[PDB]
Ligand binder design. Structure first.
Ligand SMILES: [Mn+2]
Ligand SMILES: [Zn+2]
Length: 1592
RNA sequence: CUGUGCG
C-alpha cells in the first residue's frame, strides 16, 4: 500500500460542498480494504462528475437512486404502471418533469453510442406517461472529458493515473478489467490482437459452407485443357443453337424497330404540339396576340414599396386587422390620387397595373374594391375608435419614419369608392379548372418569332419563380371544383410590350405544385389567355436563357452545313424540340433521350446486344411524352432515313445526334415527388433480395440469431455457390461456381497474369439512422426543446412574452412547419409547467390530427360555441404564467384560421388522458467497448446502416450511411484496399496517369481500327456479396515485396465477414406509407411480413448486399483480376491480343486481331457466358463493335473527339450556387473555362456572361466593374487567369487607353525594380496595410509623378458596398448551421436544397439590412445618395464609375479602380510573366478546322511553389495573424520554422495584395494544377485572336 | 427570419 496512503493524502484537496461529500469521504476514510476502496472511489468520482453536470442545469440529486414510480407517487399522481428506470437528475414542477441523464466517455464513438442508447431508452416512456398522466422532457449532457468546475484540473489526471496504478498493482474479471483499464485512457487502427475471438457454435458450418471447394493450387496445363474442352463444348451446344446474346445491327431493320417503338401510331394525339401541351398553347396565344397587337405610376410603386416594408415589422401583433389597415391606407391614397388629374385613371392607370375591380395590394395579393368596401364598413359603430387607435400607434412605439402626412387618418368616402366601382365594368375572371386546330404551322413561320417565343418563356418562368418567392405566412380574409370565382387570389405581373402587361393569378401558396391562370391586358381591356397546373421549382433553367439557346441552335444546325437544304427541314423542329423539353420537366423525357443515346451507340457501331428495344420503351402519361418522343424519332429518321453508312460525312451526323441525346440534361434532377422517390428506391433495393429469398425479419440488433435465421443464412450461402459450369439455366440469377474461382486464383498465384501479388509499400503501416433527407430529426428537436425549456425554467427566478421565440430562431441559425410545431410545443410546455372520441382509440397525439378527417364547416361552427372559462377578454400581450391556454385560444379565434383554435379547445378539455461486473455498469463504466467479438458482431452492434437516395439524370442512385464505428471500420478497409490497388497498375479509378494512358491507347486503337468493347454492367451494386471477397482473400496470399512472408489477413477476413453480417434499417416514412396503404411486389411483401411472421419490419438482414459507396475499391480489384483472367483465357484460346481497363462499374476491352467483323461473334458470346458465370452480369447497353469507344462519357471517334457542347452548357446554365456575387462570378469563371476547354464556342460564353450579369442585376445588387465574366472576350482564355480577364475587362471599359498606358509603364518600372533593379521588397508591406489613396500616391512617387497625376488618377471612383466587412445574410441553408485567404489555408490544411430556392433566399436576404457601417442598413438609400453631376467624366460608363464630387454625400464606400488595376497587373506579373505589359494590337474558316492548343505561360515565381512556403512568409510578415486564427491544429510546423526555403523570388511581394483585396483569390488559385493542359479551338476563332507580346 | 426589380 505504498500509494494508498499517497492517494489518501492527495484526495485532501476537495471541498465538501454538499453533505454527501462528507458522507462518502468519511466512509472512504474509515475503510481500508483491498476490494471495496476502488469501487467507492470510482463511484464517488462518478457522483461528483454527474453533480457537476446536472447542478449546472438546476439539478435535484436522486440521493436514494429510486425509480420514477415512487417519486411520482410522492405527490398525488395516478400510477400508469410506468416501466422502471433509474434517473440521474429529476426536476418536477406542477405537472411537468425534466430528467437529465449524464455520462462521460473519453473516446467519441462510445460517447455517441451511449448518447443514442440513453435517449432511445428514455424516449419510449413518454408515450406511456403522457397517455394517462403528466409530461416529461428528456435531456442528456455528454462530456468527452472528466473536467469540472470544482477542481483545479491538474489533480484529476493525477487521480486517474494513481487509480490505474493501484488497480494494475494487484487484482482479485478479464474483459471487465480490460474495459476499465481502457476507459481511463485519453488517446489511443488495425492489429486487433487483444480481441478474444470466441466461438458460439456457429463458425464451423459457416466454414464448410464456404471453404470446401477452395484450393488455389491448380497447375497451368490442366487449366489450358479444361478451357479447351469448355470452348469445344460451348461451340456446339449454345452457339450453334442460336442462343446467344449479341448480333449484327442490320441497320434498316433497326430503323423500323425504332420507328415502331417511338413513333406512336395507335395514339389519338394530333401532330401539332401546341394544343397537346397547355404551356405550348398558352405561349402561342400570348406571342401571337402580342406580335400582331407621368410620375403617377412611380409614386404608386413607391407607396406600395414603403407599405410593403412597414408591413414586415408586424408591430400590431395581429394579421387580419393589420391587412385591413394597410389596404385602407392603400384605398385612401387611391382616392387621394383620383381626386385630381382626371386624365389618369382611364389612360395612365389602365395601361399600367390594373384590371376589372381587381387591384393589387401589399403581399402581391389582388383584391376587389367591392368586398373591400364590404369589409371596411365593418368595425364602424362596433368600435369606430379603431382607426384612431391604430393611428396613435404610428406615433408612439413606432419607427415614426413615414410619409403618411395625410393619407392615413382620412376616413374613406364610400361614395367615391362606389363611383370608381361603377366606372369600370364587371369582367371577373373564371379560371377554368380541370378541338379545332389552327396552330399556324410553325414549320412555315419566319425566322424571328421563335426568339420572341423564348423571351415569352423566360418572362413566364421568372414570373413563376417570383410567385414561388412570395411569403408563406399569409392567410386570406375570406375563404372559398371545375370553375371557381376569383375575388381574393394572389397575382404576379410581367412585362412584354409598352402597352400590354401579362398577369399570373394563383390561389394557394407554398412550394409544392399549384394551379395558375394567365391573363393579358392590352389597353385596359381584360383578355383570357389560359390556365394550367405545374410545380414552379422545375422552371429555374429558362429564367433568362432566352439567348444562349438561340445561338446554340444556329451553331448546332450550322454543324450540318456540308449539304445545303438539310438545315431547312431539321432546324425549326430542333428549336421546337428544345422548347418541348424546356416546358416538360420530367424524368421520363431524360430517360428517353438517354435511351436514344444508347440506340445511337448501338446503331453507329457494328455489334449490339439482342435486348435493346425493351430498355428504350417508356410508358407515357398525360399525352405529353408522346409528342417529344415523336419529335425525337422523326429527327433521328430524317437524319438516318437514307444512305447513312460509315462511308460518308458520318462523324458530324453522329455528333449531331449525340448532342441531341444529351439535350436531356436541361431537365432538373431534383426528385419531383419525394415520398414516391423513397418508395421507388426501397422497392428496387428489396426486389432482388426477396426474389432470391433470404431476407429475414428484424434481428436481435446485438449479435444473436435464432435457428431459422442461421438456417436460412446457410441456405442462402449454399444456393449462391450452387452453380455448374455446363447448365445454361442460370444466366440471370445471382451466383458463381467455385470451380472457376479456383481456376482464376491458381492461375494468378503462379505469376501467369499480367500482374502478381508482389505488393510494395506494405499496407500494414448526430443524425438518426431511421430517417435520411429530413431537415430535422426527432432527436435533434427533443434536444433543442429540452435546452429551451431548461433555459425557460432557469430564468424564472410569473410573466413571459413572445420574445422566447427569438431563442428558437437563435439556435437554428417544411422548415416553417417544423418551426410552428416546436413553437406550439414550447408554448404548451410552458402552459403545463405554469400550473371526436376516435383520437382516444387512435394515436393520442393531438398535434398530428389531420384536417382531412372532418369537414371544415363543423370545425368552424364548433369553435364559435359558448365558452366562459376557455376564453378571456382582450389580446393581453403581456401573457403572465397560468393563463397561457386562454390567450392562445383568443389569438387563434381572432385570426381567420380556426384549426389552432380547435386543437387548443381539444387540449383545454383534458381529453388526452459484492460483484464487480453487475452493480458497477451504470455510473460511467464503458460496457459497450469491443473486447470479445463473434462471427456475427463485434460487441458494439451489428453494423447498422441507413438507406438513402441521390438524384441523378438517369435514375436514382442508392446510398448507405454508416455509424461512427462502421464508418471507421469501412474507412480502414478502404485504405487497405486502396493500398492493394496502388500495388496494382492497370486500375483506373483515382490514378490519373493510367487514365491518360488508357485515353491514348483507345485513341490510337481507334485511329488504327482495333476492336472495341465498352462493357457496361447492370445491377453492379446489389448483386455482389461480401462472401465473394471472403473466398477471394481466403484463396489469396498477398506476398510481401522482399520478405515473402505471406501476409495473413485474418483481421481483414474478420472485418469483411462482419460486413457480410451487416443490417440495414428501412426508412420510417415508407413503412408508414405501406402500413396506411395498383399492385407492387414490395407492398405485398410488406403486408405478408406485418403479423404473419412477426412484428413490423424495421431492420433487414441478409448476405448479398454489397452496399454501393462502401466497397468501391475491393469491388474494383475483384473485377480487375476477374477481367484479367478472362482476357488471358481468351488470348490463350483464340490467339487474339487483349488489353483492358476497369472503372468498377464499366470497363474497356481493346482487341488487336491478326490478319469484315462478322466472324467474331462467337468469342464475344463465349466471353459473355464466362462473365455471366461470374457475378458480373453485363447490361444490354454494351456495344461490341469497332467504330466508337466510350469511357465515363468520354467518347472517341476516328480522327477527333466529340465536343460535348450541350452537356457543358447545361451545367454552366444550371448549378449557380448563390452565396456572394464574387463567389458566383468565380464559379461561373471556372465552369466557363471548363466549357471553353472542350472547344464549345466563344460567342456562347459571352451570352452566358450577359445572362448571369442580367440575373445578378435583377437581384438589386447592381452591376460592378468586375461583376461577372466580361462580355466580348476572345480565345485567350488559354494562358490567362481571372486576373488577366478582369484586366481585359477594365481595359475594355476605357475606350482611349491613355492613363492606363502610363500607369502600366509605372507598373512595369515597379516590376523591374522589384525583380532585380536596385533594392526593394519588405518595405512595400509597410505602405500597403493602412488604406487606399495615399498608397496610390506612394507608388506614384516611387515611380515618379507630380500632384497633377495624384489629383487626376484619383478621379475615377467606383462603389464597393462590401467596404466595412462582408454582406451579412442568411440563406435557405441546412438547419443548425478575417480575410478569406486565411480561411482557405485553414481548409486546405484540414485533410437537398434547390438552386431555385437558393436564388430565392439570396434575393430575399439581400433586400434586408445587409451593408454595415459605423450599424446595418439597406442598399437603396446608398444607391440613391449618389449625385448625378454629369460633368462629362462620369457618363462614359453609367452606373459603374463616378467622380469625386459625385460622391460627396457618401464617401466611405468609394474606392478608386486603378488600385484594382495594380492588383490585376501585379497578379499577372507574379503568375504568368511580364508579357502583359505590352499594348494590344489587332490582326489584319469552314467551321470544321478544330485543333488542340497548349498553354504558353512562363513563370518567374519558382513555378514549383512547394507547400509550407506561404506559411513562413505570413508568419514573418504578420505574426499577429499567424498566431491566432491560423495553424492551431498542426504538429509539423517545425519544418516550416527552420527556413522552409524562405524568401521566395516573388511570394513575399504580391501576397499582401491578396491580404488587402477580397476579389482576387490568387494564392488559392496559385496552388493548383491548371487541370486542362490542352484546349480545343477552331481556326475561325484563331484568326481574330488579339496579339499582345512585350519587348525587352 | 422578413421577398417587391426584368421597360
Ligand atoms: Mn461505360
Ligand atoms: Zn392543333
Amino acid at each position: 500500500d505504498e500509494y494508498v496512503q499517497e492517494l489518501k493524502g492527495l484526495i485532501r484537496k476537495h471541498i465538501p460542498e454538499r453533505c454527501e461529500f462528507g458522507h462518502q469521504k468519511v466512509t472512504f476514510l474509515s475503510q481500508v480494504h483491498p476490494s471495496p476502496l476502488l469501487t467507492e472511489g470510482f463511484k464517488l468520482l462518478s457522483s461528483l462528475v454527474e453533480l457537476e453536470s446536472c447542478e449546472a442545469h438546476a439539478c435535484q440529486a436522486n440521493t436514494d437512486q429510486r425509480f420514477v414510480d415512487v417519486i411520482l407517487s410522492d405527490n398525488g399522481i395516478l400510477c400508469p404502471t410506468l416501466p422502471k428506470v433509474i434517473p440521474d437528475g429529476f426536476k418536477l414542477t406542477g405537472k411537468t418533469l425534466i430528467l437529465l441523464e449524464t455520462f462521460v466517455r473519453v473516446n467519441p464513438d462510445e460517447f455517441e453510442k451511449k448518447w443514442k442508447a440513453d435517449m432511445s431508452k428514455l424516449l419510449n416512456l413518454k408515450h406511456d406517461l403522457q397517455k394517462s398522466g403528466v409530461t416529461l422532457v428528456p435531456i442528456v449532457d455528454g462530456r468527452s472529458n472528466y473536467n469540472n468546475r470544482f477542481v483545479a484540473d491538474w489533480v484529476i489526471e493525477r487521480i486517474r493515473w494513481l487509480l490505474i496504478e493501484i488497480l494494475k498493482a494487484s487484482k482479485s474479471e478479464d474483459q471487465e478489467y480490460q474495459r476499465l483499464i481502457h476507459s481511463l485512457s485519453n488517446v489511443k487502427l488495425e492489429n486487433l490482437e487483444h480481441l478474444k475471438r470466441n466461438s458460439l457454435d456457429y463458425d464451423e458450418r459457416l466454414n464448410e459452407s464456404l471453404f470446401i471447394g477452395l484450393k488455389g493450387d491448380i497447375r497451368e496445363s490442366t487449366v489450358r485443357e479444361e478451357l479447351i474442352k469448355l470452348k469445344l463444348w460451348f461451340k456446339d451446344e449454345v452457339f450453334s443453337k442460336g442462343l446467344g446474346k449479341f448480333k449484327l445491327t442490320d441497320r434498316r431493320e433497326l430503323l423500323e424497330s425504332l420507328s415502331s417503338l417511338g413513333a406512336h401510331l395507335d395514339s389519338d394525339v394530333s401532330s401539332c404540339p401546341f394544343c397537346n401541351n397547355k404551356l405550348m398553347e398558352i405561349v402561342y396565344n400570348v406571342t401571337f396576340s402580342c406580335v400582331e397587337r407621368s410620375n403617377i405610376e412611380k409614386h404608386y410603386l413607391s407607396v406600395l414599396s414603403l407599405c410593403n416594408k412597414i408591413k414586415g415589422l408586424k408591430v400590431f401583433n395581429t394579421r387580419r386587422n393589420t391587412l385591413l389597415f394597410l389596404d385602407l391606407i392603400m384605398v385612401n391614397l387611391m382616392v387621394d390620387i383620383s381626386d385630381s388629374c382626371q386624365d389618369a385613371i382611364e389612360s395612365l392607370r389602365k395601361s399600367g397595373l390594373i384590371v376589372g375591380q381587381m387591384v393589387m395590394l401589399v403581399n402581391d395579393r389582388v383584391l376587389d374594391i367591392l368586398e373591400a368596401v364590404k369589409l371596411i364598413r365593418k368595425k364602424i359603430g362596433t368600435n369606430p375608435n379603431w382607426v384612431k387607435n391604430c393611428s396613435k400607434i404610428l406615433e408612439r412605439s413606432h419607427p415614426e419614419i413615414w410619409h403618411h402626412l395625410s393619407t392615413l387618418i382620412k376616413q374613406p368616402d364610400f361614395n367615391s369608392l362606389i363611383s370608381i366601382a361603377q366606372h369600370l365594368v364587371s369582367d371577373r375572371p373564371i379560371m377554368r379548372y380541370s378541338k379545332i386546330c389552327r396552330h399556324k404551322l410553325f414549320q412555315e413561320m419566319s425566322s424571328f418569332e421563335q426568339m420572341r417565343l423564348f423571351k415569352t418563356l423566360s418572362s413566364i418562368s421568372l414570373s413563376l419563380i417570383n410567385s414561388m418567392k412570395t411569403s408563406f405566412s399569409s392567410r386570406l380574409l375570406v375563404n372559398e371544383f371545375g370553375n371557381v370565382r376569383l375575388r381574393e387570389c394572389y397575382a404576379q405581373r410581367f412585362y412584354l410590350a409598352e402597352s400590354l402587361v401579362g398577369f399570373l393569378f394563383y390561389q394557394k401558396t407554398g412550394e409544392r405544385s399549384r394551379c395558375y391562370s394567365v391573363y393579358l391586358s392590352d389597353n385596359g381591356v381584360m383578355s383570357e389567355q389560359g390556365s394550367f397546373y405545374c410545380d414552379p421549382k422545375r422552371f429555374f433553367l429558362p429564367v433568362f436563357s432566352d439567348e444562349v439557346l438561340a445561338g446554340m441552335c444556329e451553331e448546332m444546325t450550322s454543324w450540318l452545313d456540308f449539304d445545303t437544304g438539310l438545315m431547312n427541314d431539321t432546324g425549326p423542329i430542333l428549336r421546337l424540340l428544345v422548347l418541348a423539353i424546356l416546358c416538360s420537366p420530367s424524368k421520363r423525357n431524360q430517360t428517353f433521350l438517354q435511351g436514344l443515346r444508347y440506340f445511337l451507340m448501338a446503331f453507329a457501331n457494328q455489334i449490339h446486344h439482342i435486348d435493346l428495344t425493351s430498355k428504350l420503351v417508356v410508358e407515357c402519361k398525360s399525352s405529353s411524352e408522346v409528342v417529344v418522343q415523336r419529335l425525337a424519332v422523326g429527327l433521328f429518321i430524317r437524319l438516318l432515313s437514307g444512305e447513312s453508312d460509315a462511308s460518308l460525312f458520318f462523324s458530324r451526323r453522329f455528333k449531331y445526334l449525340l448532342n441531341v441525346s444529351y439535350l436531356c440534361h436541361l431537365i432538373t434532377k431534383e426528385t419531383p415527388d419525394r415520398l414516391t422517390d423513397q418508395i421507388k428506391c426501397f422497392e428496387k433495393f428489396i426486389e432482388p433480395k426477396v426474389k432470391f429469398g433470404c431476407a429475414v425479419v428484424n434481428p436481435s440488433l446485438n449479435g444473436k440469431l435464432t435457428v431459422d435465421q442461421e438456417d436460412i443464412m446457410i441456405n442462402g450461402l449454399k444456393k449462391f455457390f450452387s452453380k455448374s459450369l455446363r447448365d445454361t439455366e442460370d444466366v440471370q440469377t445471382p451466383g458463381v461456381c467455385k470451380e472457376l474461382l479456383n481456376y482464376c486464383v491458381s492461375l494468378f498465384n503462379r505469376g501467369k497474369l499480367k500482374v502478381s501479388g508482389e505488393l510494395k509499400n506494405n499496407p500494414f503501416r448526430i443524425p438518426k439512422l431511421d430517417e435520411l433527407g429530413n431537415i430535422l430529426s426527432t432527436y435533434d428537436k427533443e434536444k433543442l426543446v429540452s435546452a429551451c425549456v431548461s433555459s425557460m425554467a432557469e430564468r424564472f427566478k410569473n410573466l413571459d412574452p413572445d420574445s422566447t421565440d427569438y431563442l428558437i430562431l437563435k439556435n437554428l441559425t417544411e422548415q416553417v412547419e417544423s418551426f410552428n410545431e416546436i413553437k406550439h410545443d414550447v408554448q404548451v410546455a410552458l402552459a403545463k409547467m405554469a400550473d371526436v372520441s376516435l383520437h382516444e382509440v387512435k394515436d393520442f397525439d393531438p398535434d398530428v390530427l389531420p384536417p382531412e378527417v372532418y369537414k371544415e364547416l363543423c370545425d368552424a361552427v364548433y369553435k364559435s360555441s359558448e365558452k366562459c372559462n376557455f376564453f378571456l377578454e382582450g389580446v393581453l400581450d403581456v401573457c403572465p404564467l397560468g393563463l397561457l391556454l386562454k390567450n392562445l385560444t383568443t389569438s387563434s379565434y381572432v385570426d381567420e384560421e380556426y384549426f389552432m383554435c380547435f386543437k387548443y379547445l381539444l387540449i383545454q378539455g383534458h381529453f388526452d388522458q459484492f460483484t464487480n461486473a453487475a452493480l458497477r455498469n451504470l455510473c460511467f463504466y464503458s460496457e459497450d467497448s469491443p473486447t470479445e467479438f463473434t462471427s456475427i458482431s463485434s460487441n458494439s452492434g451489428n453494423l447498422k446502416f441507413g438507406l438513402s437516395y441521390k438524384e441523378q439524370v438517369g435514375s436514382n442512385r442508392e446510398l448507405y450511411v454508416g455509424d461512427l464505428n462502421t464508418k471507421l471500420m469501412t474507412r480502414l478497409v478502404e485504405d487497405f484496399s486502396e493500398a492493394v490497388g496502388n500495388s496494382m497498375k492497370y486500375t483506373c479509378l483515382n490514378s490519373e496517369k493510367e487514365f491518360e494512358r488508357a485515353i491514348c491507347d483507345m485513341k490510337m486503337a481507334v485511329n488504327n481500327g482495333d476492336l472495341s468493347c465498352s462493357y457496361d454492367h447492370s445491377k453492379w451494386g446489389p448483386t455482389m456479396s461480401p462472401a465473394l471477397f471472403l473466398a477471394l482473400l481466403q484463396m489469396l496470399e498477398l506476398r510481401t515485396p522482399v520478405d515473402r512472408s505471406k501476409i495473413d489477413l485474418d483481421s481483414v477476413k474478420s472485418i469483411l465477414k462482419w460486413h457480410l453480417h451487416k443490417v440495414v434499417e428501412v426508412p420510417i416514412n415508407v413503412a408508414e406509407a405501406y402500413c396506411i396503404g395498383s399492385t407492387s411486389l414490395s407492398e405485398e411483401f410488406f403486408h405478408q411480413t406485418m403479423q404473419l411472421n412477426g412484428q413490423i419490419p424495421s431492420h433487414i438482414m441478409s448476405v448479398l448486399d454489397m452496399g454501393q459507396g462502401i466497397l468501391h475499391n475491393t469491388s474494383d480489384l475483384y473485377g480487375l483480376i476477374t477481367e484479367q483472367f478472362l482476357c488471358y483465357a481468351l488470348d490463350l484460346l483464340y490467339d487474339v491480343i487483349p488489353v483492358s481497363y476497369t472503372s468498377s462499374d464499366d470497363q474497356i476491352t481493346l482487341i488487336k486481331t491478326p490478319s469484315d467483323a462478322a466472324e467474331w461473334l462467337e468469342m464475344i458470346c463465349f466471353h459473355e457466358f464466362l462473365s455471366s458465370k461470374l457475378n458480373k452480369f453485363v447490361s444490354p447497353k454494351s456495344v461490341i463493335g469497332t467504330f466508337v469507344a466510350e469511357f465515363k462519357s468520354r467518347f472517341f471517334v476516328m480522327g477527333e473527339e466529340t465536343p460535348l457542347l450541350t452537356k457543358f452548357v447545361a451545367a454552366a446554365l444550371h448549378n449557380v450556387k448563390c452565396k456572394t456575387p464574387t463567389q458566383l462570378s468565380e464559379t461561373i469563371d471556372t465552369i466557363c473555362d471548363q466549357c471553353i476547354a472542350n472547344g464549345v464556342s466563344t460567342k456562347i460564353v459571352t451570352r452566358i456572361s450577359k445572362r448571369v450579369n442580367q440575373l445578378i442585376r435583377y437581384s438589386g445588387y447592381g452591376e460592378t466593374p468586375f461583376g461577372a465574366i466580361e462580355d466580348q472576350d476572345v480565345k485567350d482564355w488559354v494562358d490567362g487567369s481571372r486576373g488577366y480577364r478582369l484586366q481585359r475587362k477594365i481595359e475594355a471599359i476605357f475606350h482611349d487607353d491613355k492613363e492606363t498606358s502610363f500607369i502600366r509603364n509605372c507598373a512595369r518600372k515597379v516590376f523591374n525594380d522589384i525583380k532585380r533593379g536596385r533594392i526593394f521588397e519588405e518595405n512595400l508591406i509597410n505602405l500597403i496595410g493602412r488604406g487606399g489613396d495615399e498608397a496610390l500616391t506612394g507608388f506614384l512617387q516611387y515611380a515618379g509623378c507630380s500632384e497633377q497625376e495624384v489629383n487626376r488618377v484619383l478621379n475615377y471612383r467606383w462603389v464597393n458596398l462590401s467596404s466595412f466587412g462582408d454582406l451579412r445574410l442568411v440563406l435557405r441553408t441546412k438547419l443548425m448551421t478575417v480575410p478569406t485567404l486565411i480561411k482557405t489555408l485553414q481548409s486546405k490544411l484540414s485533410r437537398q436544397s434547390s438552386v431555385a430556392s437558393g436564388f430565392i433566399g439570396f434575393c430575399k436576404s439581400m433586400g434586408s439590412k445587409c451593408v454595415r457601417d459605423g450599424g446595418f442598413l439597406y442598399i437603396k438609400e446608398v444607391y440613391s445618395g449618389v449625385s448625378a453631376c454629369t460633368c462629362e467624366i462620369c457618363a462614359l460608363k453609367p452606373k459603374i464609375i463616378y467622380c469625386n464630387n459625385s460622391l460627396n454625400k457618401v464617401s466611405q464606400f468609394s474606392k478608386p479602380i486603378l488600385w484594382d488595376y495594380f492588383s490585376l497587373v501585379l497578379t499577372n506579373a507574379c503568375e504568368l510573366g511580364e508579357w502583359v505589359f505590352s499594348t494590344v494590337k489587332e490582326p489584319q474558316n469552314n467551321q470544321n478546322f478544330f485543333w488542340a492548343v497548349k498553354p504558353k505561360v512562363v513563370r518567374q515565381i519558382e513555378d514549383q511553389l512547394g507547400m509550407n512556403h506561404v506559411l513562413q512568409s505570413i508568419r514573418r510578415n504578420y505574426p499577429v495573424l499567424f498566431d491566432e486564427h491560423l495553424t492551431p491544429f498542426m504538429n509539423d510546423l517545425q519544418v516550416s520554422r527552420t527556413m522552409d526555403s524562405g524568401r521566395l523570388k516573388f511570394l513575399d511581394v504580391c501576397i499582401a495584395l491578396d491580404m488587402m483585396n477580397e476579389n482576387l483569390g490568387i494564392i488559392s488559385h496559385l496552388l493548383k494544377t491548371r487541370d486542362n493542359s490542352v484546349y480545343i479551338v477552331k481556326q475561325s476563332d484563331c484568326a481574330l485572336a488579339h496579339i499582345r507580346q512585350s519587348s525587352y
